Amino acid sequence: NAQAEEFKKYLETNGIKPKQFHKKELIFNQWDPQEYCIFLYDGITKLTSISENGTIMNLQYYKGAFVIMSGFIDTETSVGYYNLEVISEQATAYVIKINELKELLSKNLTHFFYVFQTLQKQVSYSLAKFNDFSINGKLGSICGQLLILTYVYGKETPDGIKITLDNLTMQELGYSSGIAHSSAVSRIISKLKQEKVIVYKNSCFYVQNLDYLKRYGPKLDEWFYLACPATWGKLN
Amino acid sequence: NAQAEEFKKYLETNGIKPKQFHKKELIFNQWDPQEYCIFLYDGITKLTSISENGTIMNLQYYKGAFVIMSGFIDTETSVGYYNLEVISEQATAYVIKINELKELLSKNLTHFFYVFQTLQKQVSYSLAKFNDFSINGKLGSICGQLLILTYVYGKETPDGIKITLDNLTMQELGYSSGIAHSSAVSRIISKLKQEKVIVYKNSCFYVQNLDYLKRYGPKLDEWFYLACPATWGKLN
DNA sequence: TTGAGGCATTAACATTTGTTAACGACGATA
């Protein structure tokens, strides 16, 4: 929040300008692997990859402020071939060429730390997410992904906790959890309404049994407490 | 590695000696979170997590030299609760308090980017591993882990590529793939043997059909090609 | 008004994986 607004100013001071993006457009993609260092400031995006046979996989979401690097800071090679798609109405981000980056952090080390610590928030997130998705199969993958969605995009209402996301199609959750067919997601979600943990009203998902998800995403809930405690407190 | 050898003699110059560890020993653990920065220099270690009901989860391995961290750098708080177990006969690492690390890298930048580099290796590795494990279920998870081990512990031989690892039980593969019962991994393996993909020799695993594994782990193969290209060329 | 396309839902059927038990091989110990 503040540590990011500080880094915001450091960029405008050295000539980096904010570029604006709209929904369904990607800052970088897997087919034009050019190494940048994106600093999303305001908006929602998802990192994705498309298999050789056209299978989509949503790896995670990013809501500003956050850092996303498509290349290494030493060798300037690609960290991997991925796409960062804008899913919110409009998003703003400070793009940087990895060339200009190493020279930019060598001056101020408190912003070096800022970027370094977010990279740590990335690793802990990946291990936590990987941990819970592997133990309980797909049923837990859904609950794990849901758990993440209620912390980052959740507000409390009398009918539960509303996930304030414009689009949550069944195939979109399946892509986040690794399920290929929407009928399989629906079957699982048909059980979560049955067991009375979630309900679908007002074109949104409302969670009524947060603990049920914590049981299938314990390492993930642990991650919010340690990495995003403010987000954690809003539901605890 | 040259970058690591420069780092080794940078810490010894500041009074940081190397502790010795033996197999089965935990450098840190999920129950006594001391926020360290481990510069594992020689040896093999697995990062593990245990649930409240006692389910082991092998998240990944670490071949020295590398960098593991149990705490952030600014907040200096934990990044999650994991155990770093030594699995070789002996391993040599430099334990340093997380606060100590802050000032050393503040002086030397070439060593700072090296630490930043290794974390970029971590992120890309986690997403690639998550990508290939979440698409093709367990069969793709088992086939994915084998692809990782062959690129790190694999040596060419006439029979096939031996995976040099002592005590690689059916359990350790399951732990590393989310499978909780040895009968389930043996069944998957009973097929990969029937399909002329691997062999059991001298209580070891020889891989004969590398391309098969590459079908179920393209992002991981991609990662070794972009992140650890030296170790990649050995099998191409 | 009709009709097209997309998303949610369910069915059914096939395949995988979860789960337990029983068997046999290998080691180790007395």
Next chain:
DNA sequence: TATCGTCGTTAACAAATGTTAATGCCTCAA
């Protein structure tokens, strides 16, 4: 030499997930 404990197989049955198809609800567009 017999006996126990670990680990790899396979079997058998339950549960979960892959997969396809059909149906119904909703928007959109003419």
